[PDB]
Amino acid sequence: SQDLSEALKEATKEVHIRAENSEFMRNFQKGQVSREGFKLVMASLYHIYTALEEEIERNKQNPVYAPLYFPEELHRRAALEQDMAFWYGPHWQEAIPYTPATQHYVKRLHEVGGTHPELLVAHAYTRYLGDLSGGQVLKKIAQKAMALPSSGEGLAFFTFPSIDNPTKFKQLYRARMNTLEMTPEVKHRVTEEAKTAFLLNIELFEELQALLPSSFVEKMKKTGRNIIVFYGSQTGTAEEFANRLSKDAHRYGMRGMSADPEEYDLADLSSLPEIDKSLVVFCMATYGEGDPTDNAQDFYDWLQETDVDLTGVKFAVFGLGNKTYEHFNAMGKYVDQRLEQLGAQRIFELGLGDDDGNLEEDFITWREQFWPAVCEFFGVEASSIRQYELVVHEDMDVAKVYTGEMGRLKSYENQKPPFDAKNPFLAAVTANRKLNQGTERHLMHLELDISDSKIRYESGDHVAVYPANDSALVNQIGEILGADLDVIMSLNNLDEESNKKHPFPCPTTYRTALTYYLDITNPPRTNVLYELAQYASEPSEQEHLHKMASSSGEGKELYLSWVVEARRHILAILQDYPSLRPPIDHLCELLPRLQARYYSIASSSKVHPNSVHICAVAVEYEAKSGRVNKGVATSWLRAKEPALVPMFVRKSQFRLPFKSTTPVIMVGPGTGIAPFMGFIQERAWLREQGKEVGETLLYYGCRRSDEDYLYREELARFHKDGALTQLNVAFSREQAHKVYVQHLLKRDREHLWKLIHEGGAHIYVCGDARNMAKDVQNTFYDIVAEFGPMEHTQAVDYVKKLMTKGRYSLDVWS
Ligand SMILES: Cc1cc2nc3c(=O)[nH]c(=O)nc-3n(C[C@H](O)[C@H](O)[C@H](O)COP(=O)(O)OP(=O)(O)OC[C@H]3O[C@@H](n4cnc5c(N)ncnc54)[C@H](O)[C@@H]3O)c2cc1C
Ligand code: HEM
Ligand SMILES: Cc1cc2nc3c(=O)[nH]c(=O)nc-3n(C[C@H](O)[C@H](O)[C@H](O)COP(=O)(O)O)c2cc1C
């Protein structure tokens, strides 16, 4: 094509098909990779990436490569050295081979980096863009096939801790590629060199291949079990889940086993109701185009043409899927919907695990609320064995007790770089003023001083903050529970081979754990209500707590109405149910951890290098339970007057264009103006350095001009200086019909189209506003359809292509 990214994708089509059809890569896809062949590819890759990054460092400021310099995000030499130490021992430096094909690849890399740097892109593309695609699945396949530690040793090459979204980063990288100015002949040479790089990889793979040459019903009867968990897996995740489920079975009054459904004629589901309180669980991953895992293919086929009467059978299904596919959890949904068709009844709601997000968290939630539903269905209300043991330290020094820090002991006082999620830096609150002019809501602008933290950030990055619960809540809970909060103690997991030895940093007091480590504000999950039912004196409230553990029936109605919809925290539950007098250690075992909260950085590191600006709206509402609830992080930050805040910075892919001449179209209603401020700052800064800056358009939205017009004065000053080219503000509540930013974009359709088409502008969409991103998206669809004469389908294809080339970026949240 014309844009370099599309030209590279099209030019390297056949060679990519060929590379992934090589015998070595095909054996890899099928899970048949050997430790020796894996050591071979990894050593070759060490040599290759050493050469590649050597030449990258050599040309990191050459204009023909400069926009692609992403050392912190992409480079591999460090991880490859870690993996060499893993796979070849301490003296790997002389133990790793250097095959002729690897030397050919390295020689070509050095030729390019030395005498033809204009082609270096073609090689980075072939490697880095590849590592951010198939590599994510290859890492799982390796973990399972070779049996590596779950800690990630040996597969550090496949891990990008600075890239939280490889799709968005690939968009950013394509954008940086298309910025490269080059003549058409040079573009053709670059595509040919990308073909050459693919061919080098192909012949490397070829050379490395050259260097290799009893029915479960009666079974459960004789083994004495009532639970069986079939796993439909390909890369071991569903197997792991099924094994952990059947492991929880034995420690709950019941007794289960995790089995493979492949070698069992599941006609033994009709023979299963003849086991006392029997139930079967299915952890089903889905592949292909809504196709079952191979180990369940037979099973799937069996459910097609069958009529086995499965009356009185108890089942539950958890599905493993990915929201990016458009057959989301087809296998799990099919098994769930179909077992009820055959006669069985659902005990717990079907789980829908997303792999785009945190699949582990989805599964932990599902299991956590599943086990109570089982214990409350069959009525086997024995009340289960604990998981953490209380050990009070009545005489113990204070320099050994956790006082709220997150990582190592006394890490909040002995601050040493680097600072990240496990070692947050305590930034000094320099400013905390009100942006909101009215009184509808309180919107605040904080500034955090990070002078000598050595923390780097860019406009568009995010800042995460570890908050503290309101101390009045902690005191009230400690009062109504009738316990002492300053008691130094510990909770030790007696699941001995679970290296998760505590629920939170220990030893510490109950006050400290309630203040910094636990989430005492979000509505409680079903599991804590079940485990609290045994502490209710009155059988009315005990029976309420029990029934609230039923996923089916009016128990779910009660749970959703009185807890979720009413938004009752733990204190509200302890208040309205005065029968509840549980201990404090069991409560600290049942409550979920206090999560950090993310905010869009509202400053540019080029004008505010030692400061990070946050723009937030304080959460505070009258819940339907009567009480007035407060947002943890926003209330905690609101009280901060210039006063430390534990924070860290997470890289995003929201980035201004490399060329200062490129125009930007920012759209951000409400708090979504947060990053754009930074943008504008940096943009203004580029004008002050004497650089030529393109158009900078802002489409902001608020209610009233005198109510919540955030940064009105600063935006006005930016506009009058020329830094902010257009200030298009849509006031939603200044007449009878509401005016949103969609209408302002629709208004300037002609100029916007000339910016996008002729100027090659970047579009940014940001903010909380629900259903707003899709409205802006449809607006741009219509603009492109109208002004560049197109069918609606051609226009949506055009806009999607823009998203691929990193010219339509999103940063939405809730
Ligand atoms: C990448 C990312 C970027 C973000 N950037 C920003 C930003 O720039 N500015 C900003 O303000 N926030 C931002 N957020 C959201 C932020 O992380 C918090 O969710 C938000 O600030 C509130 O945090 P909190 O701890 O004070 O409230 P929490 O303790 O987390 O609880 C809030 C909950 O209260 C509930 N709730 C809210 N209103 C009502 C209501 N009327 N009635 C009933 N229930 C209600 C909701 O269920 C809500 O989830 C971002 C989030 C992400 C993931
Ligand atoms: C294990 C075999 C492989 C599989 C399953 C695989 C799969 C994929 C997939 C699904 C994509 C699309 C991602 C996207 O469009 O955003 C992709 C793109 C890509 N792959 Fe592969 N791949 C394999 C082997 C390789 C190899 C060996 C290389 C190079 C050494 C490579 C280089 C690339 C590149 C550069 C892209 C990006 C194309 C673009 O968007 O411009 N792949 N691959
Ligand atoms: C080739 C491939 C195809 C996939 N297809 C789908 C799909 O169609 N629908 C879906 O929801 N998930 C799909 N997924 C997501 C998987 O279900 C997800 O990765 C799941 O965690 C796999 O579990 P496992 O490791 O036990 O095999 C697919 C994954 C791969 C690798």
Among left, alpha and beta (phi > 0; psi -120 to 50; other), residue 520 is alpha
Resolution (A): 3.3
Distance separating alpha carbons of residues 567 and 574, to the nearest angstrom:
14
Those residues whose C-beta lies under 8 Å from the C-beta of residue 535, and which sit 6 or more positions away, are 579, 580, 581, 582, 583
* DSSP for residue 350: P
The residues, ordered by sequence, that sit 6+ positions from 323 with a Cβ below 8 Å of its Cβ are: 354, 355, 356, 357
What DSSP assignment string belongs to 511-551? HHIIIIIB--SSPPPHHHHHHHHTT-SSHHHHHHHHHTT-S
Cα–Cα distances in Å, from 553 out to 377, 485, 546, 558, 595?
10, 38, 12, 9, 32
Crossing angle of the two packed helices 526-533 and 359-377, in degrees rounded to 10: 40
774 known member of a binding site: no
Ligand 1 atom closest to Cα of 443?
A: 11
All residues at 6 or more sequence positions from 17 whose CB lies less than 8 Å from its CB, including other chains: none
Rounded to 10 degrees, the C-alpha dihedral 128/132/134/135 comes to: 80
| Cα distance between residue 656 and residue 653, in whole Å | 10
Measuring from atom 11 of ligand 3, which residue has the nearest CA?
A: 321
Decide if 808 contacts 657 (C-beta within 8 A): no
Phi-psi region of 173 (alpha: psi -120 to 50; beta: other; left: phi over 0): alpha
Given the CA of residue 595, which atom of ligand 1 is nearest to it? 30
Q: Give the C-alpha distances (Å, rounded to integers) separating 51 from 45, 47, 106, 110, 131.
A: 10, 6, 6, 7, 17
CA-proximal residue: ligand 3, atom 14 (nearest): 287
What is the rounded CA–CA span in Å between residue 592 and residue 503?
A: 9
Residue type, 681: Q
Are 232 and 299 spatial neighbours (Cβ–Cβ below 8 Å)?
yes
Beta pairing class for 279-287 and 314-321 = parallel
What method was applied to determine this entry?
X-ray
Pure H helices in 387-533: 471-481, 510-512, 526-533
Burial of 171-195, coded b for 16+ CB within 10 Å and e otherwise, reads bbbbbbbbbbeeeeeebebbbebbb
Residue 321: count of CB within 10 angstroms of its CB: 26
Inter-CA distances, 417 with 423, 424, 452, 475, 637, Å = 8, 9, 9, 35, 24
384 and 252 in contact (C-beta within 8 Å)?
yes
Ligand 2 center from residue 355 Cα (angstroms): 19
Give the residue ranges of DSSP H helices in 293-444. 297-304, 330-341, 359-377
Q: Is 774 helix (H, G, I), strand (E, B) or coil?
A: helix
Count Cα neighbours of 546 within 13 Å in the Cβ-side half-sphere.
19
Catalytic residue status for 131 = no
Which residue has its alpha carbon closest to ligand 1 atom 40?
Answer: 621
Round to whole Å and give the CA distance between 296 and 302: 10
What letter would DSSP give residue 708? S
Q: Which helix (H) or strand (E) holds 449?
A: strand 443-449
Out of 375, 588, 702, 766, pick the active-site residue. 766
Buried b (16+ CB within 10 A) or exposed e, 662-688: bbbbbbbbbbbbbbbbbbbbbbbbbee
CA dist 567 and 570 (Å) reads 10
Neighbours of 233 (CB within 10 A): 23
Strand order across the 726-731 sheet: 726-731, 696-702, 664-669, 762-767, 808-812
The pair of structure tokens assigned to 139 is: 């890492």
Q: Given the residues 411, 600, 603, 605, select the one marked as catalytic.
A: 600
Task: Output the six-digit token pair for 124.
Answer: 């980075």
Nearest Cα residue to atom 36 of ligand 2: 130
Instruction: Indicate whether residue 286 lines ligand 3 (CB < 6 A).
Output: yes
Distance of CA 111 from the midpoint of ligand 2 (Å)? 25
Distance CA 623, CA 617 (A): 18
SS3 letters across 279-322:
EEEEEEEEECCCEECHHHHHHHHHHHCCCCCCCCCEEEEEEEEC
Q: Give the C-alpha separation, 475 to 594, whole Å.
A: 17
Query: 437 is written with which tokens?
Result: 């002019």
**Would you say how long the chain is, in residues?**
814
Backbone torsions φ then ψ of 767, nearest 5 degrees: 130, 175
Q: Which ligand is nearest to the CA of 600?
A: 1
Determine whether the annotation assigns residue 567 to a binding site: yes
728: left (phi over 0), alpha (psi -120 to 50) or beta: beta
The residues facing 488 across adjacent strands are: 509
CA distance 656 to 172: 10
Does the annotation list 733 as a binding residue?
Answer: yes
Report the nearest atom of ligand 1 relative to the CA of 674: 8
d(CA 285, CA 150): 20
Ligand 1 neighbourhood includes 655 CB (under 6 angstroms): no
Q: Measured on CA atoms in the order 238, 242, 248, 252, is the torsion positive or negative?
A: positive
Choose among 418, 597, 406: nearest CA to 502.
Answer: 406
If one counts every other C-beta atom within 10 angstroms of the C-beta of residue 350, the result is 19
Give the 3-state secondary structure of residue 650.
strand
Distance CA 423, CA 505 (A): 13
Is 685 designated active site?
A: no
- Could you tell me if 351 and 332 are in contact, meaning their C-beta atoms sit under 8 angstroms apart? yes
Strand 620-622, strand 628-630: pairing = antiparallel
> Nearest CA to 312 among 356, 286, 279?
279
Ligand 1 near 619 CB (within 6 A): yes
Question: Is the CB of 567 within 6 Å of ligand 1?
Answer: yes
CA dist., res. 525 & res. 568, Å (int)? 11
Contact 342, 306 (CB under 8 A): yes
506 labelled catalytic: no
Q: Which of 3, 133, 804 to mutate to test the pocket of ligand 2 (most atoms within 8 A of CB)?
A: 133
What span, in angstroms and rounded, lies between the C-alpha atoms of 282 and 258?
10
571/626 Cα distance (integer angstroms): 13
Q: Answer whether 514's CB lies under 8 Å from 553's CB.
A: no
The answer to whether the Cα torsion of 62, 63, 69, 75 is positive or negative is negative
Helix H or strand E encompassing 84: helix 77-88
Q: Is the CB of 49 under 6 A from ligand 2?
A: no
| DSSP β-bridge partners for residue 232 | 284
Alpha carbon of 308 to those of 128, 263, 344: distances in Å? 51, 18, 11
> Which ligand 2 atom sits nearest the alpha carbon of residue 174?
41
Nearest Cα residue to 318 out of 340, 296, 285? 285
Q: Which atom of ligand 2 is nearest to the CA of 205?
A: 27
How many C-beta neighbours within 10 Å does residue 793 have?
10
Q: Which residues contact 765 (CB under 8 A, 6 or more apart)?
A: 667, 668, 772, 773, 776, 777, 808, 809, 810, 811, 812
Q: Contact at 8 Å (CB) between 312 and 270?
A: no
Task: Answer for the pair 474, 485: CB distance below 8 angstroms, yes or no.
Answer: yes
Ligand 2 in contact with 130 (CB < 6 A)? yes
What's the Cα-to-Cα distance from 525 to each of 61, 317, 515, 540, 619, rounded to whole Å? Answer: 53, 19, 19, 20, 22
Element (H, E) at 753: helix 749-757
* Residue 745: Cβ-neighbour burial (10 angstroms; 0-12, 13-18, 19+): buried
Instruction: Please report, for residues 321, 325, 512, the alpha-carbon distance to residue 355 in angstroms, rounded to integers and kept in the order given.
Output: 6, 10, 34
In order, the DSSP letters of 576-622 are H-TT----HHHHHHHSPBPPPEEEEB-S-TTT-TTEEEEEEE--EEE
User: Ligand 1: does its nearest atom lie under 6 Å from the Cβ of 603?
Assistant: no
Is any ligand 1 atom within 6 A of the Cβ of residue 621? yes
Closest ligand 1 atom to 671 CA:
9
Residue 292: CB atoms within 10 A of its CB come to: 25
Contact assessment for residue 402 and residue 505, using Cβ atoms and an 8 Å cutoff: yes
Rounded Cα gap, residues 125 and 148, in angstroms: 29
Please tell me whether 441 is known to bind a ligand: yes
Among protein residues, the one with the nearest Cα to ligand 3's atom 2 is: 287
In 3D space, the residue among 488, 783, 509, 810 whose CA is nearest the CA of residue 672 turns out to be 810
CA distance 193 to 187: 10
User: Is 420's C-beta closer than 6 angstroms to any atom of ligand 2?
Assistant: no
CB 412 within 8 A of CB 646: yes
Q: Is 286 annotated as a binding residue?
A: yes
Angle at 607 between CA 605 and CA 613, to 5 degrees: 60
Please indicate whether residue 809 is annotated as part of the active site. no
- In the chain, residues preceding a discontinuity (C to N beyond 2.5 A) are 213, 642
Edge-first strand listing for the sheet containing 611-617: 597-600, 462-465, 644-650, 425-434, 443-449, 611-617
Residue appearing with tokens 């109701």: 273
Name residue 704's amino acid.
R
- Contact indicator for 469, 477 with CB cutoff of 8 Å: no
Measured at the alpha carbon of residue 529, what is the angle toward residues 528 and 534, in degrees to the nearest 5? 100
Helix axes 100-115, 184-210, angle to 10 degrees: 160
Backbone angles phi, psi at 646, to 5 degrees: -70, 115
Is the distance from CB of 8 to CB of 805 less than 8 angstroms?
no
Q: Which of 405, 512, 513 is nearest to 466 (CA)?
A: 405
Does the annotation flag 738 for ligand binding?
yes
Sorted by sequence, the CB contacts under 8 Å of residue 110 that are 6+ apart come out as: 51, 54, 55
Asked if 656 and 604 count as a contact pair (C-beta separation under 8 A), the reply is no
**How buried is 559 (Cβ within 10 angstroms: 0-12 exposed, 13-18 middle, 19+ buried)?**
buried
Extract the tokens encoding 446: 């904080």
CB-ligand 3 contact for 328 (6 Å cutoff)? yes
Cα 132 to Cα 74: distance, rounded to the nearest angstrom: 9
Residue with tokens 């609101």: 638
The answer on whether 546 is annotated among ligand-binding residues is no
Type of residue at 257: M
Cβ atoms 591, 570 nearer than 8 A: yes
**126 in ligand 3 pocket by Cβ < 6 Å?**
no
The reply to whether 621 sits in an annotated binding site is yes
DSSP element (H, E) containing 492: strand 488-493
